[PDB]
Design a protein around this ligand. Structure first.
Ligand SMILES: O=C(CCn1cnc2ccccc2c1=O)Nc1ccc(Br)cn1
Lengths: 329, 826, 248
């Protein structure tokens, strides 16, 4: 049956190439021999056998077989190398996680400078992203690594979230100890810079807000190399963490340790005065310092910016593919 | 890691901007010409220009303007680089000693902002109270020009109009006032605002908004005798001042797009206008004095003067002389006469300044057998198109071969003593239903000619409607003699067929040497071409014959010969074809993991692929198996302009952001993932757009001419005409030259006080990384031009390594010999 | 889409082990020992109750597809717990599971781990994952016992006694094949039903529908008493066979 995973062989896919270096193994583009469907295979290596199957892949197998949303990538199945060993002890073959192939990733589109997003594109993009994030948050899952690389985009304009290797369950009742440094610094929330370890699902909202801003500048907002400098950049824009705007900031471990040069005032609306108002309000609320005052995913969908976006009229990005080959004089 | 060296053989020749004024002395008339990273200062004589000084800057010159604030005897210069380095400069001369003073300096980049579509704009107030900069959408940056702002610190005013086309500071206003054409969903509009330094905001402007031509392109600030502004479009010119509104729409300007404007008469009576077909116009302001004593603008008139080179910038010097600064063709000095000549023209040519123009492609051939080597370049665009033969005979000797059409790719066939050049010319849909060329050109002046008869796409049934006046490209293969450069033959490709790739090779067991062209069927409807052909030609006995054609389902962007087989990139696919005994192409193997395979290079059984967004991929042919294998891919997202193979392990690439990088196989085989990673090992900001990498040198190296520390010779051509050389170094030689750079940067004074380390830092809108693995040869070759006190200062405490003597001190004279050796590679 | 993990009691006479000559009593014994081994090792390691149950469910499912004579049970158990820890985010190092396994097993039993205990366990993970068809997410009777108990309103002491007794019945049911016969939701109801009968409580009165004598129907649709009683019969059989008695 379709459900009997782990048995079908990777012979069933013609490997096209390598689409990236992954955490537990390389990711390959491939074509299904039977159906012709283009897929993506993530290689899982148990040959290290320090801790057997890596947990990063276990989380992605556990969570993505539960999550069914248009803006959440679908794991189609899991296939294996020809074992070629009667004895299971000898077998060191790897496992491949089958996923739907996505034509592009946001980082690739923005980094090459090849795309332009109009307001209506950003609306369609952010509605899908935040709807998917809502589905996940309502299911008590935290992505914990939202970055432009992890946001896949099909040429039609469909957005799918895809790197659930650092994703874990969230309980609003029992606060649990967690791994503090879980997001990329450019997209990391101020709470995780000051070391909450008791992070809320509003860590993922901060990341998406950085992307919202980035889609309007074509450049990331808080680009830094070290944790303190990021807090400085965030503070220059959002204001310095102070108990007046974030009363529980004093409880965070590194609040006294890590301090910005000044107690900066918030200038987010001034430095983003070139953004539409509906979006500026979305950005201002998403980039709120206090995670308990930061907006939820649902609240973003019930905003003037995204409320009335109709996703039937999806908006493909510009994605020029001709006459960019030869530059115009 | 890897160690490489980049030197500039020919400096940028394209004119990026020109201004006039009184910069060197309050008395002299100056002409400042800006080429990418280079500033040339001239003095205007009765015969021509007298050069006085040339400086380099560690930045691309984006803004260049002369101004004279109250209290100064002479004009000062503002230059803003494309990396947002701002400065105010002064000329100072002490007898024979000429130097450039940095009066103020600063970087005006904002942490947050969206770069504007129409690029950086810089303007200065007529009272020199402020410098205006339009860097980002929705913001106006005002630098106060007070004696106290030497850090050039500035403030941003919020601008409601997000899409600004052009802006100027207007004349004759009670307060500093700006006139800007902007675009919103309702069309284009002209609007005015006043600028308050005291309030640091905009106040309501003097004259009302008028909605203007949809393609309104340029704003002219007319001087006080008239006041107000002129707006130049595609079809009409309009003057707006207060309630006064004029509009002239002469049919002559509708023909070609107007790109530049300059003021002839300081009163504003006469302005010069230029268009993309080289036509030079005179715009005339017809005055009318009322009894009030007031002078009003009565009417506008446009008069055609003649033809110049397609010009980026124009400047009127004095008497009848105008300087035509060209980016696409040779810059010129032309004299305007009051009486027309017998052909009806008022423009006569005085001087021609060589511009290698956009170097679209190039080939290195030893045509004269001098053992040296010569460079034939595909240079120029449109009517300014030419082939340029360059030899390193101390200057570069440059022969020019005018084509009057755009050259695209060049290859050399020695068996036939000729060159193959792909070209495209512009024809316009005419009343016949066909098209008519604007001027005769190489593809029409060939001795013999042919037109493709292929019926591959002739089934059509796909409608493409034509409107009279629309442009089309007509693509040709030109056969050009290597000695006379006579166009011996020209083959016109099918309608709507673009020629993209050319190779001269022998294939398989075929004795005949062929010309192979790759094409793409381009329709204005298609996002990516879906039809194309690879056609084989034989140039024999003065006629080109059509040996065979292969239909492909895409554009063949690049073709390269692979050990008697044909390697071609069709859209995302990389393919290897075999040449059969039946003289047809047969596919052997394919590779499909590409977004768009734009560039191909080979070495042995290894192939380097250049992608639109996925950087560089090393692919290998497995002869035992008859297929392709992916050896290693670079996973950093870069938009490629050209790729080259340096050696079996190092690979060179050029980014669309004016950056260079080198990738090496990890050469450590602990894991399969490590091998399949191309590690960015060298990063460098060149400052030029590299279209072509070509292996070779123009220097004479046979029969014992002394070789150098550097190994290899890759020549590169760029859009601004710069030609350069990339070569490799040993670890020991790099560290010596790198340590010396750090010493030279502390000693050498930069124009604008721009940090050299900053200038060469890898730079995109999203990244800035410090340079790695590359030695700026132009810094090294500058050691020979610094004064002796400075030379000895540089060599203090300098130690060599990995040599006959592990640690050896350096004297100034030792390095003078080393650098002089390095001057021989270029 | 998703696999089916439930069989009929009658189907358990045709397990791989039964067909290799193992009798029903012996396989039942092996199942209890393996489950209790998983429970005891993990309790010593401080593992959450869900982590213990997930390992036990992996164990029970495994021996519906393989024979006890070819896969030593305490190795299988240790491997299940090791994987369960990674699935449920309560991870343990394999060496630590082996260490604890030695303490609780006699020398003959630890012989099943062969010359290299860690290797025998780590190697089995590949077979475990393929056997469980990579369906790692499991739901357990505990969450439903609490979800349903939260909707009961009444004497706190009387309801808490119901919950704890039922909770004990859940822990006990992990030693049986009930995990392979009935969804967890039904198990939670069944144990509530059993505790009520034993405590002489009428749970109907604490529900939102006090005259709905079939109170479980508002939590689990389509469950006949036939089922809830078969489950009760199976749970109490463990107590009667053993020397242990109902908790009350
Ligand atoms: O990575 C993509 C988008 C295309 N892409 C992105 N980066 C590349 C880098 C190098 C070479 C090719 C590619 C390339 O083709 N899609 C994807 C990723 C994970 C899953 Br699961 C499903 N789809």
């Amino acid at each position: 049956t379709e459900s009997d995973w782990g048995k079908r062989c990777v012979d069933k896919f013609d490997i096209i190439g390598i689409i990236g270096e992954g955490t537990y193994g390389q990711v390959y583009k491939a074509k299904d021999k039977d159906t012709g469907e283009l897929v993506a295979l993530k290689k899982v290596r148990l040959d290290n056998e320090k801790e057997g199957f890596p947990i990063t892949a276990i989380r992605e197998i556990k969570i993505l077989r539960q999550l069914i949303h248009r803006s959440v990538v679908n794991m189609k199945e899991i296939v294996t190398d020809k074992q070629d060993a009667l004895d299971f002890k000898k077998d060191k073959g790897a496992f491949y996680l089958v996923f739907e192939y996505m034509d592009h990733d946001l980082m690739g589109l923005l980094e090459s400078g090849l795309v332009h997003f109009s307001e209506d594109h950003i609306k369609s993009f952010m509605k899908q992203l935040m709807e998917g994030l809502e589905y996940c948050h309502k299911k008590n899952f935290l992505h914990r690594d939202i970055k432009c690389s992890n946001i896949l985009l099909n040429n039609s304009g469909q957005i799918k979230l895809a790197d659930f290797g650092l994703a874990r369950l969230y309980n609003s009742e029992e606060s649990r100890p967690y791994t503090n440094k879980v997001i990329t610094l450019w997209y990391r929330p101020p709470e995780l810079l000051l070391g909450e370890e008791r992070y809320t699902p509003a860590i993922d909202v901060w990341s998406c807000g950085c992307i919202l801003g980035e889609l309007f500048t074509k450049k990331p907002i808080f680009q830094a190399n070290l944790e303190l400098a990021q807090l400085e950049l965030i503070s220059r824009l959002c204001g310095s963490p102070c108990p007046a705007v974030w009363p529980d900031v004093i409880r965070l471990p590194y609040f006294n340790t890590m301090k910005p040069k000044k107690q900066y005032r918030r200038r987010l609306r001034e430095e983003f005065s070139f953004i539409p108002s509906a979006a500026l309000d979305l950005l201002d609320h998403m980039l709120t310092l206090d995670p308990s005052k930061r907006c939820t995913a649902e609240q973003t969908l019930q905003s003037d910016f995204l409320k009335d976006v109709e996703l039937s009229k999806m908006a493909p990005p510009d994605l020029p593919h001709w006459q960019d080959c030869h530059e115009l004089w | 890691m890897s160690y490489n060296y980049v030197v500039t053989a020919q400096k940028p020749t394209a004119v990026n901007g020109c201004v006039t004024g009184h910069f060197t002395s309050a008395e002299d008339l100056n002409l400042l010409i800006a080429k990418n990273t280079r500033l040339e200062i001239y003095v205007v004589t009765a015969e021509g220009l007298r050069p006085v000084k040339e400086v380099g800057m560690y930045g691309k010159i984006a803004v260049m303007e002369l101004f004279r604030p109250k209290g100064e005897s002479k004009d000062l210069l503002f230059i803003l680089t494309a990396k947002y380095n701002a400065c105010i400069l002064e000329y100072k001369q002490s007898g024979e000693s000429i130097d450039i003073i940095t009066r103020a300096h600063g970087n005006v980049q904002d942490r947050i902002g969206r770069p504007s579509e129409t690029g950086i704009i810089g303007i200065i107030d007529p009272e020199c109270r402020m410098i205006g900069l339009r860097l980002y959408d929705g913001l106006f940056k005002v630098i106060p020009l007070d004696r106290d702002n030497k850090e050039l610190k500035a403030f941003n005013i919020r601008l409601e109009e997000l899409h600004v086309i052009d802006v100027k500071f207007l004349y004759g206003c009670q307060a500093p006032t700006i006139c800007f054409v902007y675009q919103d969903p309702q069309g284009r509009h002209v609007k005015t605002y006043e600028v308050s330094l005291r309030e640091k905001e905009f106040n309501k402007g003097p004259w009302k908004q008028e909605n203007v031509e949809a393609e309104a392109s340029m704003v002219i600030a007319v001087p006080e005798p008239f006041g107000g502004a002129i707006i130049i479009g595609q079809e009409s010119i309009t003057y707006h001042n207060g309630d006064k509104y004029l509009a002239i729409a002469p049919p002559i300007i509708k023909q070609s797009t107007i790109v530049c404007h300059n003021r002839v008469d300081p009163n504003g009576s006469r302005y010069l206008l230029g268009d993309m077909e080289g036509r030079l116009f005179m715009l005339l302001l017809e005055k009318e004095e009322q009894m009030d004593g007031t002078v009003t603008l009565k009417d506008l008139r446009v008069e055609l003067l003649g033809e110049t080179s397609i010009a980026e910038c124009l400047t009127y010097l004095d008497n009848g002389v105008v300087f035509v600064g060209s980016r696409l063709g040779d810059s010129q000095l032309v004299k305007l006469n009051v009486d027309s000549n017998e052909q009806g023209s008022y423009v006569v040519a005085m001087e021609t300044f060589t511009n290698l123009g956009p170097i679209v492609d190039m080939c290195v051939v030893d045509l004269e057998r001098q053992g040296q080597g010569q460079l034939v370049t595909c240079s120029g665009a449109f009517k300014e198109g030419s082939l340029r033969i360059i030899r390193n005979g101390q200057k570069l000797h440059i022969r020019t071969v005018p084509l009057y059409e755009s050259p695209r790719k060049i290859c050399y066939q020695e068996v036939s003593q000729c060159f193959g050049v792909l070209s495209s010319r512009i024809e316009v849909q005419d009343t016949s239903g066909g098209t008519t060329a604007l001027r005769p050109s190489a593809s029409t002046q060939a001795l013999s000619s042919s037109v493709s008869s292929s019926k591959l796409f002739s089934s059509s049934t796909a409608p493409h409607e034509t409107s009279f006046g629309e442009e089309v490209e007509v693509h040709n293969l030109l056969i050009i003699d290597q000695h006379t450069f006579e166009v011996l033959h020209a083959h016109q490709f099918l309608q709507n067929e673009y020629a993209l790739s050319l190779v001269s090779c022998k294939l398989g067991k075929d004795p005949n040497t062929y010309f192979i062209v790759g094409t793409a069927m381009v329709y204005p409807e298609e996002a990516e071409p879906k039809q194309g052909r690879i056609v084989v030609f034989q140039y024999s006995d003065g006629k080109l014959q059509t040996v065979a054609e292969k239909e492909v389902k895409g554009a063949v962007y690049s073709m390269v010969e692979f050990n008697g087989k044909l390697l071609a990139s069709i859209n995302s696919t990389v393919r290897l074809y075999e040449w059969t005994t039946e003289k047809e192409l047969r596919t052997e193997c394919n590779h499909y993991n590409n977004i768009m395979a734009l560039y191909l290079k080979t070495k042995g059984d290894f192939i380097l692929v250049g992608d639109l967004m996925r950087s560089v991929l090393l692919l290998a042919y497995k002869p035992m198996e008859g297929n392709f294998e992916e050896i290693a891919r670079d996973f950093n997202p870069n938009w490629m302009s050209a790729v080259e193979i340096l050696d079996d392990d190092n690979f060179l690439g050029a980014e669309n952001a004016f950056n260079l990088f080198v990738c090496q196989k990890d050469s450590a085989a602990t894991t399969d993932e490590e091998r399949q990673h191309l590690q960015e090992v060298g990063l460098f900001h060149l400052g030029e757009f590299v279209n072509v990498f070509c292996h070779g040198s123009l220097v004479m190296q046979n029969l014992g001419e002394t070789s150098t520390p550097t190994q290899g010779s890759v020549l590169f051509g760029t859009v601004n005409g710069m030609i350069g050389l990339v070569t490799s170094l040993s670890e020991s030689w790099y560290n010596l030259l790198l340590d010396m750079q750090n010493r030279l940067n502390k000693v050498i004074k930069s124009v604008g006080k721009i940090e050299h380390s900053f200038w060469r830092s890898f730079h995109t809108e999203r990244k800035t990384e410090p340079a790695t693995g590359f030695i700026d040869g132009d810094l090294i070759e500058s050691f020979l031009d610094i004064s002796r006190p400075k030379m000895q200062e540089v060599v203090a405490n300098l130690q060599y390594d990995d040599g006959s003597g592990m640690k050896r001190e350096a004297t100034a004279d030792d390095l003078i010999k080393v650098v002089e050796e390095l001057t021989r590679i270029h | 889409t998703k696999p089916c993990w439930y069989w009929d009691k009658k189907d358990l006479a045709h397990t791989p082990s039964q067909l290799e000559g193992l009798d029903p009593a012996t396989e039942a014994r092996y199942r209890r020992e393996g489950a209790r081994f998983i429970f005891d090792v993990g309790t010593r390691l401080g593992l959450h109750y869900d982590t213990l149950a997930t390992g036990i469910i992996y164990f029970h499912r495994f021996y519906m597809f393989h024979s006890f004579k070819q896969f030593p049970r305490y190795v299988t158990g240790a491997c299940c717990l090791f994987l369960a820890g990674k699935v449920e985010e309560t991870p343990k190092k394999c060496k630590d599971i082996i260490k604890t396994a030695r303490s609780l097993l006699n020398d003959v039993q630890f012989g099943q781990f062969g010359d290299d205990p860690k290797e025998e366990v780590m190697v089995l993970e590949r077979i475990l994952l393929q056997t469980i068809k990579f369906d790692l997410q499991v739901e357990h009777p505990y969450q439903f016992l609490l979800k349903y108990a939260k909707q009961l309103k009444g004497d706190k002491n009387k309801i808490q006694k119901l919950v704890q007794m039922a909770w004990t019945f859940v822990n006990d049911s992990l030693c049986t094949t009930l995990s392979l016969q009935w969804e967890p939701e039904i198990i939670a109801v069944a144990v509530m039903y059993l505790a009520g009968r034993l405590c002489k409580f009428e749970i109907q009165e604490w529900t939102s529908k006090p005259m709905y004598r079939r109170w479980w129907e508002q939590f689990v649709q389509d469950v006949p008493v036939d089922v809830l009683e078969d489950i009760c019969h199976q749970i109490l059989d463990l107590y009667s066979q053993g020397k242990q008695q109902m908790p009350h």
